[PDB]
Amino acid sequence: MKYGVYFAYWEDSWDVDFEKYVRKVKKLGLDILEVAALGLVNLPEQKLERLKQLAEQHDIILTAGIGLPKEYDVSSTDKTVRRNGITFVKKVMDAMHQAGIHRIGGTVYSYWPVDYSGPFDKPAARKHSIESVRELAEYARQYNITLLIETLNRFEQFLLNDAEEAVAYVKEVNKPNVKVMLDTFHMNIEEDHIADAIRYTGDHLGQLHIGEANRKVPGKGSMPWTEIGQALKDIRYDGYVVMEPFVKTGGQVGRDIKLWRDLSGNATEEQLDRELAESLEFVKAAFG
């Protein structure tokens, strides 16, 4: 298994420089850095190449996270919006290729965060989503890119809220480079039992995001880490485990995560480094 962290752990916005995090993640003994697709898509070619070279130099695997905004809703019944979203994701994949990034995960199949103030049509959004994802899966092939379909809690999305819906959705898409991404934060809200959801997903599981129920670093909460560790052994998961802790309130990241109090005790960059190092040791012990 390979362990990583989302750069956003340390930041207040999605669109920042990533180069610093490649060295840092290697220093901390991690295998993977996950960066925001948003911070790649208009990055100059010079900087996409520099990022690729830094990852090679440090032997770090780079992955990309995305939440498509309303304007790029690939699940929209509005054809103009749908096509705008597809074009935007193709552009994201063009940039991914130059940075040497092969995996894109998150809400790449609809928009995030969902706005429930207006009405929606789950059935119609779903079939548009599947056709959009098949087309993006086909475009991805030329770059050996894999799409990771994130299962989200009801408050952030309406399409895929549990492992059952996500597995059914991905089976129907029926593409080898389209897999399910599970997330302890989201599973904690929607599943009867977190370990059983992982077991159910089995061969469909392309990536696991991990954090506590309130998105603190593993070890600070009551997530059943040993059971999760056992479930991953049960499906012989040899894939990527990416820590996705959010403990900072006030920024664009704070607002989109909806964190309205500090959970870091005003932790400095250095303090967040040490806690993540301890968290990683804890998770690896918990996973054997």
Closest CA to 90 of 52, 15, 159, 141: 141
Containing 1, the helix (H) or strand (E) segment is none
CATH number at residue 195: 3.20.20.150
Alpha helices per DSSP H over the chain: 19-27, 45-58, 79-99, 122-141, 163-173, 184-190, 194-201, 225-234, 252-257, 269-286
Structure tokens given for 255: 């607002």
Task: Provide the residue type at 139 as one letter.
Answer: Y
Q: Which residue has the tokens 């077991």?
A: 199
Active-site positions read: 150, 244
Centre a 10 Å sphere on the Cβ of residue 134 and count the other Cβ atoms it contains: 14
Count of domains forming the chain: 1
**What residues contact residue 36 under an 8 Å CB cut-off, 6+ apart?**
7, 8, 14, 15, 64, 65, 66
201 DSSP assignment: H
**Helices 194-201 + 225-234 axis angle, to 10:** 20
Q: Which residue has the tokens 């998961």?
A: 237
CA distance 66 to 109: 10
Q: Which residue has the tokens 């909806």?
A: 258
Structure tokens given for 120: 């929606």
Give the chain's end-to-end CA distance (angstroms, integer): 11
**What residues contact residue 183 under an 8 Å CB cut-off, 6+ apart?**
150, 151, 152, 208, 209, 210, 211, 244
CA distance 201 to 191: 12
φ/ψ of residue 187, rounded to 5: -60, -40
Cβ atoms of residues 83 and 137 within 8 Å: no
Per-position b or e across 7-26, b if 16+ CB within 10 A of its CB: bbbbbeebebebeebbebbb
**Helices 45-58 + 19-27 axis angle, to 10:** 10
DSSP 45-109: HHHHHHHHHHHHHHT-EEEEEEE--GGG-TT-SSHHHHHHHHHHHHHHHHHHHHHT--EEEEE-S
Closest CA to 231 of 201, 195, 258: 195
Cβ atoms of residues 275 and 267 within 8 Å: yes
Cβ atoms of residues 91 and 84 within 8 Å: no
CA distance 242 to 237: 13
Judged by DSSP in three states, 209 sits in strand
CA distance 142 to 144: 6
Task: Provide the residue type at 241 as one letter.
Answer: V
Resolution (A): 2.2
Task: Provide the residue type at 268 as one letter.
Answer: T
Task: Provide the residue type at 255 as one letter.
Answer: R
Closest CA to 278 of 105, 47, 267: 267
CA distance 129 to 110: 6
What's the domain range around 91?
A: 2-286
Query: Across-strand partners of 150?
Result: 181
Cα distances (Å, whole numbers) of residue 181 to 50, 54, 55, 108, 162: 28, 26, 23, 11, 11
Structure tokens given for 154: 């009801």
Cβ atoms of residues 65 and 37 within 8 Å: yes
CA distance 129 to 107: 11
Closest CA to 131 of 109, 153, 150: 109
Structure tokens given for 137: 């899966």
Q: Which residue has the tokens 């059914």?
A: 168
CA distance 96 to 115: 28
Closest CA to 170 of 128, 205, 119: 205
